[PDB]
Amino acid sequence: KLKEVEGTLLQPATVDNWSQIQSFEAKPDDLLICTYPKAGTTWIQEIVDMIEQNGHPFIEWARPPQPSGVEKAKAMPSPRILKTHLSTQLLPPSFWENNCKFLYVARNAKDCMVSYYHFQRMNHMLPDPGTWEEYFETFINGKVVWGSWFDHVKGWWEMKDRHQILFLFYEDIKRDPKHEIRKVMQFMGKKVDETVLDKIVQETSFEKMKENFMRKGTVGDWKNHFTVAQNERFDEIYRRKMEGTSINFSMEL
Ligand SMILES: Nc1ncnc2c1ncn2[C@@H]1O[C@H](COP(=O)(O)O)[C@@H](OP(=O)(O)O)[C@H]1O
């Protein structure tokens, strides 16, 4: 079972808590970590946490009678670090009004499709994704929890021009983690200590975090999944959906 808000699939308890979620009061010093599912939430959260420490309430989460994500957030001392998978359309509007910091991480659509497929298989709280061939179409149509990859990324990319958004790419972090993590430290108003930065880079590698779903943690696993026929179909749909947007992704390391 899943419920919907404005046609976007969401966990039922989330939808039941929608009026509380939407009336959430943001604060100007909030830092909101925003990702489409599988674009790098676990990774970026670990990076932010290490930077804070140095060397988070899920706003839409609910599970009565336990405290909801917004109840937990309401009680958190500032500066609050929070997270969401909500699109710009569904985000509580107080975050826009308070000129909050947003840390957005994007990841290529093909690797997101693969990661989400395996996640739906291993996670009982997410629907059975069907065969790979079925899921391919499902994901392109956005019929997954938190909605379309395309709508998510386009919306957040558009907003970066008007709001305080540090817009990062998963593949850039994989390629040069020190370069990207330095940007997060600066965004968070931290004095960059090269020695602390170096520790964060080494401690947040896939290998370190995996030992302590962390599946493969690379770029380009999509090439192992997509047939050539699937790839040609995908590239055509992608061209149509992404037409006119200035965003570009890396597809391999
Ligand atoms: N330290 C790390 N470095 C690189 N990728 C990581 C990572 N920790 C988690 N990931 C990857 O990020 C994806 C999970 O994203 P989210 O946290 O948004 O659900 C998974 O991708 P794969 O399924 O491609 O391995 C996961 O393996």
PDB file of C-alpha atoms and ligand atoms in Angstrom:
ATOM      1  CA  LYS A   1       0.000   0.000   0.000  1.00  0.00           C
ATOM      2  CA  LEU A   2       1.086   3.510  -0.919  1.00  0.00           C
ATOM      3  CA  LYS A   3      -0.917   6.727  -0.983  1.00  0.00           C
ATOM      4  CA  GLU A   4      -0.505   9.758  -3.255  1.00  0.00           C
ATOM      5  CA  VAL A   5      -0.128  13.518  -2.998  1.00  0.00           C
ATOM      6  CA  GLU A   6      -0.773  15.359  -6.246  1.00  0.00           C
ATOM      7  CA  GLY A   7      -0.097  12.099  -8.102  1.00  0.00           C
ATOM      8  CA  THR A   8       3.250  11.353  -6.375  1.00  0.00           C
ATOM      9  CA  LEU A   9       3.451   8.009  -4.569  1.00  0.00           C
ATOM     10  CA  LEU A  10       4.378   8.320  -0.866  1.00  0.00           C
ATOM     11  CA  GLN A  11       4.374   6.066   2.214  1.00  0.00           C
ATOM     12  CA  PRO A  12       0.888   5.971   3.703  1.00  0.00           C
ATOM     13  CA  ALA A  13       1.871   7.443   7.109  1.00  0.00           C
ATOM     14  CA  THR A  14       3.536  10.361   5.241  1.00  0.00           C
ATOM     15  CA  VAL A  15       0.339  11.185   3.416  1.00  0.00           C
ATOM     16  CA  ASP A  16      -1.659  10.835   6.660  1.00  0.00           C
ATOM     17  CA  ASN A  17       0.724  13.437   8.218  1.00  0.00           C
ATOM     18  CA  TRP A  18       0.558  15.818   5.222  1.00  0.00           C
ATOM     19  CA  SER A  19      -1.028  18.822   6.867  1.00  0.00           C
ATOM     20  CA  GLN A  20       1.634  18.692   9.710  1.00  0.00           C
ATOM     21  CA  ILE A  21       4.402  18.336   7.109  1.00  0.00           C
ATOM     22  CA  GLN A  22       3.168  21.295   5.072  1.00  0.00           C
ATOM     23  CA  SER A  23       2.802  23.634   8.071  1.00  0.00           C
ATOM     24  CA  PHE A  24       6.383  22.943   9.220  1.00  0.00           C
ATOM     25  CA  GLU A  25       8.178  26.097  10.344  1.00  0.00           C
ATOM     26  CA  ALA A  26      11.692  26.335   8.848  1.00  0.00           C
ATOM     27  CA  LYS A  27      14.407  28.586  10.291  1.00  0.00           C
ATOM     28  CA  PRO A  28      16.971  30.607   8.322  1.00  0.00           C
ATOM     29  CA  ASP A  29      19.915  28.634   9.664  1.00  0.00           C
ATOM     30  CA  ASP A  30      18.386  25.233   8.759  1.00  0.00           C
ATOM     31  CA  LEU A  31      20.469  23.126   6.400  1.00  0.00           C
ATOM     32  CA  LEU A  32      18.197  20.917   4.300  1.00  0.00           C
ATOM     33  CA  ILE A  33      19.790  17.886   2.556  1.00  0.00           C
ATOM     34  CA  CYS A  34      17.713  17.119  -0.516  1.00  0.00           C
ATOM     35  CA  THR A  35      18.083  14.084  -2.768  1.00  0.00           C
ATOM     36  CA  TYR A  36      16.022  12.023  -5.140  1.00  0.00           C
ATOM     37  CA  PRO A  37      16.073   8.452  -3.686  1.00  0.00           C
ATOM     38  CA  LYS A  38      19.367   6.659  -4.386  1.00  0.00           C
ATOM     39  CA  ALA A  39      21.239   9.823  -5.519  1.00  0.00           C
ATOM     40  CA  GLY A  40      23.551   9.732  -2.462  1.00  0.00           C
ATOM     41  CA  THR A  41      21.619  10.576   0.738  1.00  0.00           C
ATOM     42  CA  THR A  42      23.532   8.139   3.026  1.00  0.00           C
ATOM     43  CA  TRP A  43      26.888   9.353   1.658  1.00  0.00           C
ATOM     44  CA  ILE A  44      26.185  13.124   1.853  1.00  0.00           C
ATOM     45  CA  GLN A  45      24.667  12.743   5.350  1.00  0.00           C
ATOM     46  CA  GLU A  46      27.857  11.072   6.577  1.00  0.00           C
ATOM     47  CA  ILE A  47      29.950  13.850   4.974  1.00  0.00           C
ATOM     48  CA  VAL A  48      27.813  16.615   6.573  1.00  0.00           C
ATOM     49  CA  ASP A  49      27.885  14.838   9.951  1.00  0.00           C
ATOM     50  CA  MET A  50      31.666  14.515   9.863  1.00  0.00           C
ATOM     51  CA  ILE A  51      32.079  18.162   8.884  1.00  0.00           C
ATOM     52  CA  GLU A  52      29.774  19.191  11.745  1.00  0.00           C
ATOM     53  CA  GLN A  53      31.636  17.079  14.338  1.00  0.00           C
ATOM     54  CA  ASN A  54      34.269  17.771  13.012  1.00  0.00           C
ATOM     55  CA  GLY A  55      36.352  14.948  11.604  1.00  0.00           C
ATOM     56  CA  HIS A  56      18.838  14.300  10.993  1.00  0.00           C
ATOM     57  CA  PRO A  57      15.031  14.350  10.967  1.00  0.00           C
ATOM     58  CA  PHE A  58      13.500  13.128   7.748  1.00  0.00           C
ATOM     59  CA  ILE A  59      10.846  15.820   7.389  1.00  0.00           C
ATOM     60  CA  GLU A  60       8.208  13.704   5.603  1.00  0.00           C
ATOM     61  CA  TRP A  61       8.731  10.548   7.724  1.00  0.00           C
ATOM     62  CA  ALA A  62       5.901   9.459  10.056  1.00  0.00           C
ATOM     63  CA  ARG A  63       5.097   6.279  11.949  1.00  0.00           C
ATOM     64  CA  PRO A  64       2.534   6.892  14.678  1.00  0.00           C
ATOM     65  CA  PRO A  65       2.599   6.620  17.651  1.00  0.00           C
ATOM     66  CA  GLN A  66       6.371   7.341  17.413  1.00  0.00           C
ATOM     67  CA  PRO A  67       7.468  10.983  17.051  1.00  0.00           C
ATOM     68  CA  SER A  68       7.188  12.169  13.399  1.00  0.00           C
ATOM     69  CA  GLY A  69      10.002  13.780  11.397  1.00  0.00           C
ATOM     70  CA  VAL A  70       8.459  17.249  11.906  1.00  0.00           C
ATOM     71  CA  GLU A  71       7.952  16.668  15.679  1.00  0.00           C
ATOM     72  CA  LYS A  72      11.634  15.681  15.968  1.00  0.00           C
ATOM     73  CA  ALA A  73      12.710  18.687  13.865  1.00  0.00           C
ATOM     74  CA  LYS A  74      10.562  21.113  15.873  1.00  0.00           C
ATOM     75  CA  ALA A  75      12.480  20.190  19.020  1.00  0.00           C
ATOM     76  CA  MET A  76      16.011  20.190  17.498  1.00  0.00           C
ATOM     77  CA  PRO A  77      18.408  23.002  18.553  1.00  0.00           C
ATOM     78  CA  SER A  78      19.667  25.305  15.782  1.00  0.00           C
ATOM     79  CA  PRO A  79      21.458  25.070  13.431  1.00  0.00           C
ATOM     80  CA  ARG A  80      19.213  22.208  12.422  1.00  0.00           C
ATOM     81  CA  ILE A  81      20.344  19.643   9.856  1.00  0.00           C
ATOM     82  CA  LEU A  82      17.348  18.062   8.180  1.00  0.00           C
ATOM     83  CA  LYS A  83      16.615  15.877   5.140  1.00  0.00           C
ATOM     84  CA  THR A  84      13.967  15.266   2.541  1.00  0.00           C
ATOM     85  CA  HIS A  85      13.338  13.436  -0.734  1.00  0.00           C
ATOM     86  CA  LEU A  86      10.488  15.872  -1.572  1.00  0.00           C
ATOM     87  CA  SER A  87      10.369  17.561  -4.986  1.00  0.00           C
ATOM     88  CA  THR A  88      10.225  21.384  -5.099  1.00  0.00           C
ATOM     89  CA  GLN A  89       6.462  21.138  -5.747  1.00  0.00           C
ATOM     90  CA  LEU A  90       5.800  19.167  -2.548  1.00  0.00           C
ATOM     91  CA  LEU A  91       8.384  20.854  -0.233  1.00  0.00           C
ATOM     92  CA  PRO A  92       6.816  22.693   2.790  1.00  0.00           C
ATOM     93  CA  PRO A  93       6.790  26.305   1.658  1.00  0.00           C
ATOM     94  CA  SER A  94       8.365  27.746   4.838  1.00  0.00           C
ATOM     95  CA  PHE A  95      11.774  26.549   3.555  1.00  0.00           C
ATOM     96  CA  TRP A  96      11.576  28.987   0.604  1.00  0.00           C
ATOM     97  CA  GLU A  97      10.439  31.920   2.825  1.00  0.00           C
ATOM     98  CA  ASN A  98      13.325  31.581   5.301  1.00  0.00           C
ATOM     99  CA  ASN A  99      16.092  31.581   2.740  1.00  0.00           C
ATOM    100  CA  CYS A 100      17.389  28.267   4.113  1.00  0.00           C
ATOM    101  CA  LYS A 101      20.557  26.494   2.961  1.00  0.00           C
ATOM    102  CA  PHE A 102      19.802  23.535   0.642  1.00  0.00           C
ATOM    103  CA  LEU A 103      22.378  20.877  -0.135  1.00  0.00           C
ATOM    104  CA  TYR A 104      21.181  19.030  -3.232  1.00  0.00           C
ATOM    105  CA  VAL A 105      22.908  15.923  -4.618  1.00  0.00           C
ATOM    106  CA  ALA A 106      21.977  14.777  -8.159  1.00  0.00           C
ATOM    107  CA  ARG A 107      23.029  11.479  -9.753  1.00  0.00           C
ATOM    108  CA  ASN A 108      22.636  10.270 -13.349  1.00  0.00           C
ATOM    109  CA  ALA A 109      19.200   8.795 -14.167  1.00  0.00           C
ATOM    110  CA  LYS A 110      20.556   5.421 -15.357  1.00  0.00           C
ATOM    111  CA  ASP A 111      22.512   4.694 -12.189  1.00  0.00           C
ATOM    112  CA  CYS A 112      19.550   5.936 -10.116  1.00  0.00           C
ATOM    113  CA  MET A 113      17.260   3.465 -11.919  1.00  0.00           C
ATOM    114  CA  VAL A 114      19.618   0.567 -11.187  1.00  0.00           C
ATOM    115  CA  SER A 115      20.148   1.517  -7.534  1.00  0.00           C
ATOM    116  CA  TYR A 116      16.388   1.995  -6.952  1.00  0.00           C
ATOM    117  CA  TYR A 117      15.575  -1.353  -8.620  1.00  0.00           C
ATOM    118  CA  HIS A 118      17.847  -3.348  -6.240  1.00  0.00           C
ATOM    119  CA  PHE A 119      16.694  -1.275  -3.257  1.00  0.00           C
ATOM    120  CA  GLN A 120      13.007  -2.062  -4.011  1.00  0.00           C
ATOM    121  CA  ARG A 121      13.983  -5.750  -4.146  1.00  0.00           C
ATOM    122  CA  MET A 122      15.758  -5.802  -0.789  1.00  0.00           C
ATOM    123  CA  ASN A 123      13.424  -3.413   1.092  1.00  0.00           C
ATOM    124  CA  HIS A 124      10.095  -4.797   2.341  1.00  0.00           C
ATOM    125  CA  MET A 125       8.676  -1.278   2.706  1.00  0.00           C
ATOM    126  CA  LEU A 126       8.987  -0.710  -1.040  1.00  0.00           C
ATOM    127  CA  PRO A 127       6.950  -2.505  -3.704  1.00  0.00           C
ATOM    128  CA  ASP A 128       8.356  -5.467  -5.643  1.00  0.00           C
ATOM    129  CA  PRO A 129       9.875  -3.807  -8.743  1.00  0.00           C
ATOM    130  CA  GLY A 130       8.977  -6.695 -11.070  1.00  0.00           C
ATOM    131  CA  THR A 131      11.566  -7.874 -13.607  1.00  0.00           C
ATOM    132  CA  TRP A 132      14.293  -5.469 -14.730  1.00  0.00           C
ATOM    133  CA  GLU A 133      12.420  -5.063 -18.020  1.00  0.00           C
ATOM    134  CA  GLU A 134       9.213  -4.038 -16.192  1.00  0.00           C
ATOM    135  CA  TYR A 135      10.972  -1.691 -13.748  1.00  0.00           C
ATOM    136  CA  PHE A 136      12.724   0.119 -16.602  1.00  0.00           C
ATOM    137  CA  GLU A 137       9.349   1.434 -17.841  1.00  0.00           C
ATOM    138  CA  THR A 138       8.022   1.981 -14.296  1.00  0.00           C
ATOM    139  CA  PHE A 139      11.000   4.179 -13.412  1.00  0.00           C
ATOM    140  CA  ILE A 140      10.871   6.139 -16.678  1.00  0.00           C
ATOM    141  CA  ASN A 141       7.168   6.830 -15.936  1.00  0.00           C
ATOM    142  CA  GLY A 142       8.020   7.958 -12.396  1.00  0.00           C
ATOM    143  CA  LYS A 143       5.750   5.328 -10.795  1.00  0.00           C
ATOM    144  CA  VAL A 144       7.998   4.876  -7.803  1.00  0.00           C
ATOM    145  CA  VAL A 145       7.915   6.322  -4.273  1.00  0.00           C
ATOM    146  CA  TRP A 146       8.837  10.072  -4.398  1.00  0.00           C
ATOM    147  CA  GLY A 147       7.878  10.328  -8.048  1.00  0.00           C
ATOM    148  CA  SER A 148       9.786  11.035 -11.276  1.00  0.00           C
ATOM    149  CA  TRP A 149      13.587  11.420 -11.317  1.00  0.00           C
ATOM    150  CA  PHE A 150      13.073  13.936 -14.170  1.00  0.00           C
ATOM    151  CA  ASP A 151      10.624  16.162 -12.333  1.00  0.00           C
ATOM    152  CA  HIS A 152      12.773  16.087  -9.163  1.00  0.00           C
ATOM    153  CA  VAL A 153      16.061  17.057 -10.754  1.00  0.00           C
ATOM    154  CA  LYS A 154      14.561  19.647 -13.160  1.00  0.00           C
ATOM    155  CA  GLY A 155      12.680  21.402 -10.284  1.00  0.00           C
ATOM    156  CA  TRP A 156      15.704  21.601  -7.972  1.00  0.00           C
ATOM    157  CA  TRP A 157      18.032  22.674 -10.821  1.00  0.00           C
ATOM    158  CA  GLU A 158      15.558  25.520 -11.711  1.00  0.00           C
ATOM    159  CA  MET A 159      15.457  26.687  -8.077  1.00  0.00           C
ATOM    160  CA  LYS A 160      19.246  26.926  -7.647  1.00  0.00           C
ATOM    161  CA  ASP A 161      19.157  30.317  -9.453  1.00  0.00           C
ATOM    162  CA  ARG A 162      16.758  31.864  -6.859  1.00  0.00           C
ATOM    163  CA  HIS A 163      17.657  30.116  -3.570  1.00  0.00           C
ATOM    164  CA  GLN A 164      20.732  29.204  -1.528  1.00  0.00           C
ATOM    165  CA  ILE A 165      21.341  25.780  -3.085  1.00  0.00           C
ATOM    166  CA  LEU A 166      24.661  24.005  -3.245  1.00  0.00           C
ATOM    167  CA  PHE A 167      23.977  21.662  -6.159  1.00  0.00           C
ATOM    168  CA  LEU A 168      26.351  18.720  -6.266  1.00  0.00           C
ATOM    169  CA  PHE A 169      26.680  15.626  -8.474  1.00  0.00           C
ATOM    170  CA  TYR A 170      27.279  12.133  -7.130  1.00  0.00           C
ATOM    171  CA  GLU A 171      29.714  11.416  -9.970  1.00  0.00           C
ATOM    172  CA  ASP A 172      31.804  14.557  -9.111  1.00  0.00           C
ATOM    173  CA  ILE A 173      32.055  13.382  -5.482  1.00  0.00           C
ATOM    174  CA  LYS A 174      33.143   9.918  -6.669  1.00  0.00           C
ATOM    175  CA  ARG A 175      35.685  11.454  -9.077  1.00  0.00           C
ATOM    176  CA  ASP A 176      37.250  13.957  -6.691  1.00  0.00           C
ATOM    177  CA  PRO A 177      35.758  13.667  -3.173  1.00  0.00           C
ATOM    178  CA  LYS A 178      38.169  16.221  -1.628  1.00  0.00           C
ATOM    179  CA  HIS A 179      37.226  18.891  -4.167  1.00  0.00           C
ATOM    180  CA  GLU A 180      33.476  18.455  -3.552  1.00  0.00           C
ATOM    181  CA  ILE A 181      33.691  18.026   0.248  1.00  0.00           C
ATOM    182  CA  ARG A 182      35.688  21.256   0.428  1.00  0.00           C
ATOM    183  CA  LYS A 183      32.722  22.988  -1.178  1.00  0.00           C
ATOM    184  CA  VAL A 184      30.348  21.546   1.471  1.00  0.00           C
ATOM    185  CA  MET A 185      32.657  22.774   4.295  1.00  0.00           C
ATOM    186  CA  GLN A 186      32.629  26.264   2.790  1.00  0.00           C
ATOM    187  CA  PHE A 187      28.842  26.202   2.285  1.00  0.00           C
ATOM    188  CA  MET A 188      28.415  25.184   5.913  1.00  0.00           C
ATOM    189  CA  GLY A 189      30.561  28.176   6.969  1.00  0.00           C
ATOM    190  CA  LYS A 190      33.354  25.993   8.331  1.00  0.00           C
ATOM    191  CA  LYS A 191      36.994  27.001   8.334  1.00  0.00           C
ATOM    192  CA  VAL A 192      38.668  24.586   5.971  1.00  0.00           C
ATOM    193  CA  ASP A 193      41.306  22.651   7.848  1.00  0.00           C
ATOM    194  CA  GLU A 194      43.150  20.568   5.174  1.00  0.00           C
ATOM    195  CA  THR A 195      43.989  17.926   7.724  1.00  0.00           C
ATOM    196  CA  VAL A 196      40.316  17.506   8.843  1.00  0.00           C
ATOM    197  CA  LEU A 197      39.251  17.570   5.169  1.00  0.00           C
ATOM    198  CA  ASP A 198      41.716  14.760   4.408  1.00  0.00           C
ATOM    199  CA  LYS A 199      40.296  12.644   7.228  1.00  0.00           C
ATOM    200  CA  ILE A 200      36.697  13.172   6.021  1.00  0.00           C
ATOM    201  CA  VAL A 201      37.670  12.125   2.482  1.00  0.00           C
ATOM    202  CA  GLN A 202      39.242   8.862   3.663  1.00  0.00           C
ATOM    203  CA  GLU A 203      36.533   8.023   6.245  1.00  0.00           C
ATOM    204  CA  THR A 204      33.594   8.566   3.836  1.00  0.00           C
ATOM    205  CA  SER A 205      34.854   6.261   1.085  1.00  0.00           C
ATOM    206  CA  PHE A 206      32.424   3.493   0.071  1.00  0.00           C
ATOM    207  CA  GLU A 207      34.897   0.901   1.378  1.00  0.00           C
ATOM    208  CA  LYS A 208      35.095   2.510   4.883  1.00  0.00           C
ATOM    209  CA  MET A 209      31.414   3.159   5.202  1.00  0.00           C
ATOM    210  CA  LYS A 210      30.427  -0.336   3.947  1.00  0.00           C
ATOM    211  CA  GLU A 211      32.328  -2.048   6.741  1.00  0.00           C
ATOM    212  CA  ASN A 212      30.818   0.559   9.091  1.00  0.00           C
ATOM    213  CA  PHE A 213      21.945  -0.487   1.572  1.00  0.00           C
ATOM    214  CA  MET A 214      25.504   0.061   0.530  1.00  0.00           C
ATOM    215  CA  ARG A 215      25.438  -1.929  -2.672  1.00  0.00           C
ATOM    216  CA  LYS A 216      28.306  -1.090  -5.057  1.00  0.00           C
ATOM    217  CA  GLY A 217      28.814   2.642  -4.718  1.00  0.00           C
ATOM    218  CA  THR A 218      30.218   3.409  -8.184  1.00  0.00           C
ATOM    219  CA  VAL A 219      29.332   5.255 -11.423  1.00  0.00           C
ATOM    220  CA  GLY A 220      28.320   3.317 -14.554  1.00  0.00           C
ATOM    221  CA  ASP A 221      26.794   0.127 -13.074  1.00  0.00           C
ATOM    222  CA  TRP A 222      23.921   1.031 -15.450  1.00  0.00           C
ATOM    223  CA  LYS A 223      26.033  -0.407 -18.335  1.00  0.00           C
ATOM    224  CA  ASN A 224      25.767  -3.836 -16.702  1.00  0.00           C
ATOM    225  CA  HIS A 225      21.965  -3.621 -16.618  1.00  0.00           C
ATOM    226  CA  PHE A 226      20.781  -1.722 -19.711  1.00  0.00           C
ATOM    227  CA  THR A 227      20.601  -3.630 -22.997  1.00  0.00           C
ATOM    228  CA  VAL A 228      21.637  -1.614 -26.041  1.00  0.00           C
ATOM    229  CA  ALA A 229      17.921  -1.514 -27.052  1.00  0.00           C
ATOM    230  CA  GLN A 230      17.013  -0.162 -23.607  1.00  0.00           C
ATOM    231  CA  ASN A 231      19.767   2.410 -23.863  1.00  0.00           C
ATOM    232  CA  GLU A 232      18.634   3.717 -27.245  1.00  0.00           C
ATOM    233  CA  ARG A 233      15.027   4.012 -26.052  1.00  0.00           C
ATOM    234  CA  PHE A 234      16.165   5.711 -22.844  1.00  0.00           C
ATOM    235  CA  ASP A 235      18.399   8.255 -24.557  1.00  0.00           C
ATOM    236  CA  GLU A 236      15.534   9.299 -26.821  1.00  0.00           C
ATOM    237  CA  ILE A 237      13.063   9.775 -23.890  1.00  0.00           C
ATOM    238  CA  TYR A 238      15.761  11.544 -21.889  1.00  0.00           C
ATOM    239  CA  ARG A 239      16.439  13.975 -24.767  1.00  0.00           C
ATOM    240  CA  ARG A 240      12.733  14.808 -24.922  1.00  0.00           C
ATOM    241  CA  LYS A 241      12.268  15.217 -21.145  1.00  0.00           C
ATOM    242  CA  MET A 242      15.471  17.156 -20.565  1.00  0.00           C
ATOM    243  CA  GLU A 243      15.204  19.314 -23.671  1.00  0.00           C
ATOM    244  CA  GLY A 244      16.192  22.873 -23.007  1.00  0.00           C
ATOM    245  CA  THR A 245      17.576  22.289 -19.487  1.00  0.00           C
ATOM    246  CA  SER A 246      21.234  23.253 -18.974  1.00  0.00           C
ATOM    247  CA  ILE A 247      22.049  20.384 -16.625  1.00  0.00           C
ATOM    248  CA  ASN A 248      24.567  17.765 -17.713  1.00  0.00           C
ATOM    249  CA  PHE A 249      25.584  14.438 -16.109  1.00  0.00           C
ATOM    250  CA  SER A 250      28.654  12.212 -16.200  1.00  0.00           C
ATOM    251  CA  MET A 251      27.742   8.636 -17.125  1.00  0.00           C
ATOM    252  CA  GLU A 252      30.979   6.838 -16.192  1.00  0.00           C
ATOM    253  CA  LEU A 253      34.136   7.299 -14.089  1.00  0.00           C
TER     254      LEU A 253
HETATM  255  N1  LIG B   1      30.527   6.284   0.761  1.00  0.00           N
HETATM  256  C1  LIG B   1      29.840   6.072  -0.419  1.00  0.00           C
HETATM  257  N2  LIG B   1      30.419   6.283  -1.628  1.00  0.00           N
HETATM  258  C2  LIG B   1      29.794   6.071  -2.814  1.00  0.00           C
HETATM  259  N3  LIG B   1      28.519   5.669  -2.882  1.00  0.00           N
HETATM  260  C3  LIG B   1      27.822   5.402  -1.739  1.00  0.00           C
HETATM  261  C4  LIG B   1      28.423   5.617  -0.420  1.00  0.00           C
HETATM  262  N4  LIG B   1      27.495   5.254   0.519  1.00  0.00           N
HETATM  263  C5  LIG B   1      26.384   4.907  -0.166  1.00  0.00           C
HETATM  264  N5  LIG B   1      26.580   4.981  -1.513  1.00  0.00           N
HETATM  265  C6  LIG B   1      25.626   4.651  -2.606  1.00  0.00           C
HETATM  266  O1  LIG B   1      24.509   5.574  -2.727  1.00  0.00           O
HETATM  267  C7  LIG B   1      23.348   4.836  -3.131  1.00  0.00           C
HETATM  268  C8  LIG B   1      22.315   4.908  -1.989  1.00  0.00           C
HETATM  269  O2  LIG B   1      21.756   6.215  -2.054  1.00  0.00           O
HETATM  270  P1  LIG B   1      20.674   6.713  -0.958  1.00  0.00           P
HETATM  271  O3  LIG B   1      21.504   6.870   0.283  1.00  0.00           O
HETATM  272  O4  LIG B   1      20.162   8.008  -1.541  1.00  0.00           O
HETATM  273  O5  LIG B   1      19.619   5.629  -0.815  1.00  0.00           O
HETATM  274  C9  LIG B   1      23.802   3.402  -3.361  1.00  0.00           C
HETATM  275  O6  LIG B   1      24.278   3.284  -4.727  1.00  0.00           O
HETATM  276  P2  LIG B   1      24.342   1.855  -5.501  1.00  0.00           P
HETATM  277  O7  LIG B   1      22.972   1.184  -5.290  1.00  0.00           O
HETATM  278  O8  LIG B   1      24.638   2.307  -6.900  1.00  0.00           O
HETATM  279  O9  LIG B   1      25.528   1.152  -4.845  1.00  0.00           O
HETATM  280  C10 LIG B   1      24.934   3.320  -2.357  1.00  0.00           C
HETATM  281  O10 LIG B   1      25.773   2.196  -2.532  1.00  0.00           O
END
